[PDB]
Amino acid sequence: PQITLWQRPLVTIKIGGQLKEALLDTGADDTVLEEMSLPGRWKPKMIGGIGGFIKVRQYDQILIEICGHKAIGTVLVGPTPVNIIGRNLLTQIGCTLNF
Amino acid sequence: PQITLWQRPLVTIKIGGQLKEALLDTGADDTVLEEMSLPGRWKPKMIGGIGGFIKVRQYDQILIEICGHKAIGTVLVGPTPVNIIGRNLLTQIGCTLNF
Numbered sequence: 500p501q502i503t504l505w506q507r508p509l510v511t512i513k514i515g516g517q518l519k520e521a522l523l524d525t526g527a528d529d530t531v532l533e534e535m536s537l538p539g540r541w542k543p544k545m546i547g548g549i550g551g552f553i554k555v556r557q558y559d560q561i562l563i564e565i566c567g568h569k570a571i572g573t574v575l576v577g578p579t580p581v582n583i584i585g586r587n588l589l590t591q592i593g594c595t596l597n598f
Numbered sequence: 599p600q601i602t603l604w605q606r607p608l609v610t611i612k613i614g615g616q617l618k619e620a621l622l623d624t625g626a627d628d629t630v631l632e633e634m635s636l637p638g639r640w641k642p643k644m645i646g647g648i649g650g651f652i653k654v655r656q657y658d659q660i661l662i663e664i665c666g667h668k669a670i671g672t673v674l675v676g677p678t679p680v681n682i683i684g685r686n687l688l689t690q691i692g693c694t695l696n697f
């Protein structure tokens with residue numbers, strides 16, 4: 500699909516059998532979701548945004564469906580203001596910027 | 599052009615006779631640039647992202663040339679770690695997300 504940017508590029512994602520809304524964010528290197536429970540062990544990671552840094556939990560090889568497209572990759576969990584789908588997963592679904 | 603997301607989507611912009619590198623950020627509602635001098639009146643504003651909020655100066659009706667395309671819109675100036683081209687201007691150059 501082709502998504503314009505007159506409004507936030509929010510899409511529905513499915514993770515852990517649950518539907519959530521997330522933002523397709525080309526400015527985010529990684530994918531970070533709001534506090535939730537995921538399987539396996541996690542590793543620590545620090546990500547920096549416009550307001551500073553936050554500590555998140557990194558989970559690898561997580562299944563996530565974005566707009567019906569299945570992806571399997573790294574997902575960060577932490578105190579993010581909104582669910583963010585970053586470049587690591589945008590590339591998996593073949594997302595590009597066009598103009 | 600068609601921009602892939604393997605790397606950060608950085609482009610060159612021209613604002614106030616100055617060339618700067620900026621990130622095409624679909625996750626950003628507005629455009630925010632590092633501290634610089636811009637003509638005209640401005641209003642204080644607080645924007646929140648990953649890490650918290652930062653105070654910026656809001657300038658309106660600013661002209662910017664993005665990768666060769668002219669665009670007019672609001673530009674926020676403040677302590678951002680990187681120059682960000684947000685949706686307010688991305689829409690003006692006809693930028694869309696595709697997959």
Ligand SMILES: O=C(NCc1c(F)cccc1Cl)[C@H](OCc1ccccc1)[C@H](O)[C@@H](O)[C@@H](OCc1ccccc1)C(=O)N[C@H]1c2ccccc2C[C@H]1O
Pocket residue numbers: 522524525526527528529530531546547548549580581583585621623624625626627628629630645646647648679680682684
């Ligand atoms: O910060 C953002 N938007 C804030 C904002 C606003 F609310 C109004 C006007 C302008 C802006 Cl930038 C955007 O985030 C979505 C969001 C929407 C609404 C509220 C909070 C977050 C912005 O795109 C955000 O995702 C992005 O900010 C720009 C940037 C880019 C590179 C380095 C520093 C700052 C960002 O923080 N990216 C980092 C990130 C995110 C997740 C995982 C890893 C990493 C590493 C970096 O790449």
